[PDB]
Amino acid sequence: AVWGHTQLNRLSFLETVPVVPLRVSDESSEDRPTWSLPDIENVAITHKKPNGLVDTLAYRSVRTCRWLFDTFSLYRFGSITESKVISRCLFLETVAGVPGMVGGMLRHLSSLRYMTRDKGWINTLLVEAENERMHLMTFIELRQPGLPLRVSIIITQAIMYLFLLVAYVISPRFVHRFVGYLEEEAVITYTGVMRAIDEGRLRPTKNDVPEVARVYWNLSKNATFRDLINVIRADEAEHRVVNHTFADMHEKRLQNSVNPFVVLKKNP
Amino acid sequence: AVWGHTQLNRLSFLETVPVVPLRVSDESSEDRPTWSLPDIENVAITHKKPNGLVDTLAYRSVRTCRWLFDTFSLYRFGSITESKVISRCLFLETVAGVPGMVGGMLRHLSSLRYMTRDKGWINTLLVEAENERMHLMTFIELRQPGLPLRVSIIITQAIMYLFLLVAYVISPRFVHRFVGYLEEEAVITYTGVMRAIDEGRLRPTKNDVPEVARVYWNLSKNATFRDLINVIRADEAEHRVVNHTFADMHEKRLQNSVNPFVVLKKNP
Numbered sequence: 001a002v003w004g005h006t007q008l009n010r011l012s013f014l015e016t017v018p019v020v021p022l023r024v025s026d027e028s029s030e031d032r033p034t035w036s037l038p039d040i041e042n043v044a045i046t047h048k049k050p051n052g053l054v055d056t057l058a059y060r061s062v063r064t065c066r067w068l069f070d071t072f073s074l075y076r077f078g079s080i081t082e083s084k085v086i087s088r089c090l091f092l093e094t095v096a097g098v099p100g101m102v103g104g105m106l107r108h109l110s111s112l113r114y115m116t117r118d119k120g121w122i123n124t125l126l127v128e129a130e131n132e133r134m135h136l137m138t139f140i141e142l143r144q145p146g147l148p149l150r151v152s153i154i155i156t157q158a159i160m161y162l163f164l165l166v167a168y169v170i171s172p173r174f175v176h177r178f179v180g181y182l183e184e185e186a187v188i189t190y191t192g193v194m195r196a197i198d199e200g201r202l203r204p205t206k207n208d209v210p211e212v213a214r215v216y217w218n219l220s221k222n223a224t225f226r227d228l229i230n231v232i233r234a235d236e237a238e239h240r241v242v243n244h245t246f247a248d249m250h251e252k253r254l255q256n257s258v259n260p261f262v263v264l265k266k267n268p
Numbered sequence: 269a270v271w272g273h274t275q276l277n278r279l280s281f282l283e284t285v286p287v288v289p290l291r292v293s294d295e296s297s298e299d300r301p302t303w304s305l306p307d308i309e310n311v312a313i314t315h316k317k318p319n320g321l322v323d324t325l326a327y328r329s330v331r332t333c334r335w336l337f338d339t340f341s342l343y344r345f346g347s348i349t350e351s352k353v354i355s356r357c358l359f360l361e362t363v364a365g366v367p368g369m370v371g372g373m374l375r376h377l378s379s380l381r382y383m384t385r386d387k388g389w390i391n392t393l394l395v396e397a398e399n400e401r402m403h404l405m406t407f408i409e410l411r412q413p414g415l416p417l418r419v420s421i422i423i424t425q426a427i428m429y430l431f432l433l434v435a436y437v438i439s440p441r442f443v444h445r446f447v448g449y450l451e452e453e454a455v456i457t458y459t460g461v462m463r464a465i466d467e468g469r470l471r472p473t474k475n476d477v478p479e480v481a482r483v484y485w486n487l488s489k490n491a492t493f494r495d496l497i498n499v500i501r502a503d504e505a506e507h508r509v510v511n512h513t514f515a516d517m518h519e520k521r522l523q524n525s526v527n528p529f530v531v532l533k534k535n536p
């Protein structure tokens with residue numbers, strides 16, 4: 001390590017900015033999903049029974065939202081394509097990148113002012129927030145969108161930021177649960193797509209899988225489009241449980257407990 | 269670890285929170301400091317020049333905040349003591365947590381809304397916000413603060429949070445400059461403290477170091493109160509440069525250029 005007091009005693013490294021590479025492995029934190037595709041081949045669709053008015057409210061937000069989206073996206077009118085898959089999935093990660101961020105931060109500030117230990121919830125919500133971004137940079141590559149969709153993103157994030165921000169204030173049981181179902185709805189989408197290839201109801205023409213994604217998911221150089229999905233969907237299922245476990249931890253007043261999943265990924 | 273479809277497919281993990289241990293490592297990301305004590309020994313006090321109004325103004329805004337906070341915290345009143353110091357820093361780290369955070373959280377939303385690579389900023393600031401939050405997490409473990417101080421912290425937090433937030437949106441350079449110029453003082457103060465220990469005016473009793481500190485900073489189980497202030501001094505010296513470096517890039521219409529520390533920390 002050549003990181004020390006000489007470098008710390010400097011005023012700037014603006015000097016050095018025109019001689020440092022744009023390496024696509026510096027995009028993310030050194031904190032990557034490590035899957036294996038035979039195994040994540042068998043991620044299944046699930047569903048969690050709603051307990052109270054909150055899990056119910058959550059569920060209705062998330063079904064009502066879908067219906068509307070499916071109709072304003074025109075998505076289930078006529079056949080499928082690769083346009084509409086990528087489009088839905090690009091738009092939607094813009095919104096997906098947020099919750100974990102407004103939650104991640106809230107736990108941060110909440111720690112700081114009460115000077116209480118966070119027992120590991122923050123980073124997970126932060127490294128989610130990154131993940132779902134990373135899906136969006138990946139989807140950036142396969143298809144760039146016209147102004148129309150670039151706008152809808154802005155005005156939507158504007159809205160979805162705020163809502164989340166104040167829901168996560170009031171009942172971050174509402175919000176951790178609300179995510180839970182959004183991941184359940186997604187982990188469908190991404191199977192239905194993995195089952196579309198299989199058969200031949202859709203022709204992947206991006207069997208050059210983006211560089212960004214290759215380094216991010218550590219896929220071998222000959223990965224297909226399906227191979228992308230399967231690792232996105234696995235990540236999407238990780239949150240499905242994690243934000244349901246978190247919504248459950250709230251239900252029974254365990255917001256101050258240790259985030260199980262820091263141990264459940266390192267283990268004995 | 270064993271983290272595959274079978275966990276992903278099991279619905280919640282509420283069941284397991286009574287059986288997960290509370291391991292001090294897990295409080296923080298794995299993305300920690302890694303100093304060498306005699307290297308960091310020669311962390312030195314530096315003062316970068318203001319360029320424009322923005323730089324000069326941000327620099328006044330720190331010196332006014334130091335003049336205020338010192339007199340009003342009675343700090344300027346005779347002899348250095350161990351406890352008025354831990355009180356000092358404890359407070360300061362509860363704010364030092366915030367701007368690293370709003371920084372990541374604002375660049376992140378931009379990334380998702382304009383669909384663009386971040387190129388390694390988001391994560392470098394987010395660890396800064398964690399590093400300070402960890403300083404805190406150590407400091408609190410040296411002294412519990414009283415309600416009059418628990419109360420000042422919770423008021424501060426909002427006034428700052430919403431300061432940093434509107435000032436970020438407005439002018440990130442101003443912030444980064446402001447934080448550069450804040451963290452200069454961070455270095456002044458912690459150096460001087462070690463100038464009290466090496467010497468005599470301070471003869472501290474907390475020469476146990478809390479275990480949040482030792483796993484986070486990788487120190488021996490026989491590290492001193494000097495040593496701990498010295499890595500913190502290091503940590504703060506890291507933060508000092510980066511934010512002056514960031515503001516500078518922002519000054520030189522270079523916002524979206526790769527963050528140049530993702531190499532200067534990594535290059536093998």
Ligand SMILES: Cc1cc(O)ccc1C(=O)OCCCCCCCCCCCCCC[PH](c1ccccc1)(c1ccccc1)c1ccccn1
Nearest residue numbers: 107110111114116168169170171172173250251253255256
């Ligand atoms: C809160 C606190 C104060 C101290 O002096 C010391 C420690 C703590 C503390 O809990 O440490 C912070 C731990 C990190 C998480 C931040 C939690 C602090 C805010 C919530 C504490 C109250 C318990 C949740 C009641 P919230 C709730 C949400 C989910 C599950 C259960 C309860 C609620 C319920 C019914 C009616 C109205 C509100 C709620 C209210 C306010 C903000 C967020 N959520």
Ligand SMILES: [Fe+3]
Nearest residue numbers: 093096132186
């Ligand atoms: Fe997603």
Ligand SMILES: [Fe+3]
Nearest residue numbers: 096183186236
């Ligand atoms: Fe998702």
Ligand SMILES: [O-]
Nearest residue numbers: 092096186236
């Ligand atoms: O998704």
Ligand SMILES: [O-]
Nearest residue numbers: 360361364454
């Ligand atoms: O600080």
